[PDB]
Subunit: 275 residues, 4 copies
């Protein structure tokens, strides 16, 4: 077996993954896609599998696609990256399967956004389908607030930042739950509590079964191989899926959970892509 690790900005995660490959005696090399171009050639086919780690979605998407063209299986796959990287696409797969999500209405213009606000009532959450580190997630309390948010989103220099995901405002336990799965296997979860005085959110949490099931069904449906899952507790739904990440960070995960994520990843790869 030989693996290629695809990176652009090498963080602790990619170092850990590199380190895990070496000491598990896996043949590998690194291609830095911030530095090297990717031909549509046939001899990238020398790798049995690629670990897709670029820090930007377009780099992850396109490097996976190029490697796929050469017959190389990528973790994660280009289709999975396209789904996890877009909340509307993620919500669509989950909703179809009956996996709970925050109650959501999609609006694709300023006019539609106001109508969605009106259909949903206040308070509500409005976020775009892309990015963004808690960015552009707005808690909207009345029509005046909505109208100014609509105007600000309209003037964003990006097209997908203009689609609105209009959601119920979930407030129950004041925390975000993040989990990591390798294949169908849940490694663990930790909780991120909302800081004072915010409305928006690091300790290990014991995973009850209701949580484990929510997470495992979510990964199965998006076909994820190495992903994180962000979960919100809901008073009636129990647990709803908020987000999947197809290039998950795990330094904050490793410290809360004690799980050697990198080791689990390389073991997984050995089991499934060796011969």
């Amino acid at each position: 077996m030989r693996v290629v690790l695809i990176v652009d900005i090498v963080r602790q995660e990619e170092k850990l993954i590199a380190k895990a490959l070496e000491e598990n005696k896996v043949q590998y090399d690194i291609i830095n896609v911030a530095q090297e171009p990717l031909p549509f050639n046939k001899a990238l086919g020398r790798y049995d599998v690629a670990i897709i780690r670029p820090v930007s979605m377009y780099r992850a998407l396109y490097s996976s696609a190029v490697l796929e063209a050469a017959g190389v299986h990528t973790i994660n796959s280009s289709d999975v990256i396209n789904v996890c990287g877009d909340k509307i696409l993620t919500y669509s797969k989950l909703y179809r399967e009956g996996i709970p999500i925050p109650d959501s209405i999609i609006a694709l213009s300023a006019e539609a956004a106001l109508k969605a606000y009106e259909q949903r009532g206040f308070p509500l959450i409005d976020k775009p389908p892309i990015g963004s580190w808690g960015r552009l997630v707005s808690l909207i309390r009345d029509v005046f607030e909505g109208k100014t948010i609509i105007e600000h989103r309209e003037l964003m220099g990006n097209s997908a930042l203009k689609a609105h995901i209009v959601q119920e405002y979930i407030q129950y336990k004041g925390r975000d739950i993040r989990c990591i799965a390798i294949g169908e296997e849940l490694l663990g979860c930790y909780a991120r509590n909302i800081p004072p005085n915010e409305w928006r959110a690091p300790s290990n949490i014991e995973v009850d079964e209701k949580l484990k099931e929510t997470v495992v069904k979510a990964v199965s449906i998006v076909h994820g191989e190495f992903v994180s899952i962000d979960i919100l507790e809901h008073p009636n739904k129990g647990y709803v899926v908020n987000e999947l990440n197809d290039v998950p960070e795990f330094k904050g995960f490793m410290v809360a959970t004690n799980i050697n994520v990198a080791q689990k990843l390389v073991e997984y790869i050995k089991e499934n892509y060796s011969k």
Copy 2:
């Protein structure tokens, strides 16, 4: 059976589909997604089939995704819109199956782009993955031009534009060939010649549409390509290549067809509505 026609900007094409639905006695609604929101609900499940027609790529993608959540059969589907809407994703699928494409190198940074230019030599073509009416398709003559184009695309606000498709510059037949397929069957093709003061063939620049005699090699290229990407109602842009015969350049997942109609005499909307009636009524 009932159909939703999803639109934002109503063009001749959308009017034609609407009229074709009415004239074939198909129960249809139109939902304008530049005006109305789309809830993730069971209610839209009242539609058996959605005809996805927004002009904007994000609007086609998301309207299709929401309708799919409700169990509606979308033409085209969101995964298909995601692939067709992106030349790198399209080239990736096509290359894997050995369907000819233009020789392409993918560069995802300024540094990587310069390397691709040097690996390839000049002149070359550099274009982004998304689509732009031939906007941002650059004929790069040298390193200076490459560097300025790199610099410009870096500063544009949506990161897909940071990915450079660095391609062979095809010079041969002096035209673009555009075909349409319905349910993986070729309807017809036409050609749009490069106007005399350019090197791109787009309608947005020039060239009247003229019918093409589709040979067997061209027919099979189209069918194989549309089949691999699973497009149910697509157009396919093909370039004639000195060595490869026909290479697939683009697939469009919300195909234009008023130019295609004048060149080919084919009632595209009629054939679409027949195909839907025949395959999704029960």
Copy 3:
């Protein structure tokens, strides 16, 4: 005397100005700066006066500047357009002279902005220095709202949008007052009332206009403000304040006047052309 009329989008205003020039028998040409380039040359010196009417601020600024280079007297001048087109610059000049403005704090970063909010308390108005038809004028009710607004403006293409004007929220007469001055003489004023229910009175969708008796306090406020900015043909936007009486909100250096005319029955174009003849004929 020869006049150039500089336009990009021809509105009723520009038609009116062309008519008034023609009807007063003034030699004029029109240059559309969305169509035609402007050389730094001495050729343009054939015009004695330029009337600067492009709808975009940058086109007004730049066309004025190129005309000034050739020695043409521009109305308004580029210096004046730079000042009037920017609320921070305008407020600075007025404040120095003791001309009342809304109480304002300027914040040039996310951190400064949060401090400004907490310094003045809520509700408050937050707007950028650069106009936008009452867009991006936000009524900020709390810290959560200010934080999201800050986050949004951080991510726009124009760095001027990152400067926050953090203002007292004026609630008194439920209207704006717009006046027009030519050569530092007041023509008149009218009012635009806040529609129920908005916090902004802009034409879109500011039903309804009405009229106002200009008292001496309002007249002098307008004259003083227009004189300090050196505006030769401007509109000025005034808010009636419970304590300060009249405060200056904005000057417009390419004033609209279609609505001013319906309200006041004043021939703004005629007054402009007579002013130019009286002062610039030689």
Copy 4:
């Protein structure tokens, strides 16, 4: 006398200016405008002089303007920042006075840009009026390259980044000359040479910085330029020209000087502080 030093990102230059103030026994405060908001008041009037050093134009412009509102003399002033920070406004002031500049044509749309190219002939330089470390300065060799550049600028698509300055391509001695002046006094000049694979001298990794003997024609050119813009502490970028001798390309209102300092051995900060004391002590 007391000075306020206005900063946002403290670079060597700012540290050096702070140090010079300290060593020369000058009472001074620092206000970091990336951290603190700026009220309109009378209290900032405690400062006799403000040294405006924010790294971003909007912060320099707006901090200067607020300080001016309080009666504080700013180095440089808001009007000077507005002129120097915009090459069209700079070229306009210089051209009116007969100070040589690169032959320039301003175009304010895609359509005008192509007409400007045709008027200018090839090769030409096209750059926006707003700085960017040689960003978006394009060397255009024919109409195809021109067409793709126009397309890329249109998609920026913010700012004055849509306005084109279309210039003669100057190529004589393969270098840029940069000078610094305090008041009307020229401190000196150095050259930045174009690196083997370039047309710009900024420039990531290039611009090997040679010291340069200031002749009288150069000195006249620089002094006249600084006189017309009323700069108090500026850099001036000059190009050698076969027929014009020297032309002014740029002025900078927040000049960098660590590189200038090492090329000329001029203690810029010291000279600045000496000048402030000499002039603003009272």
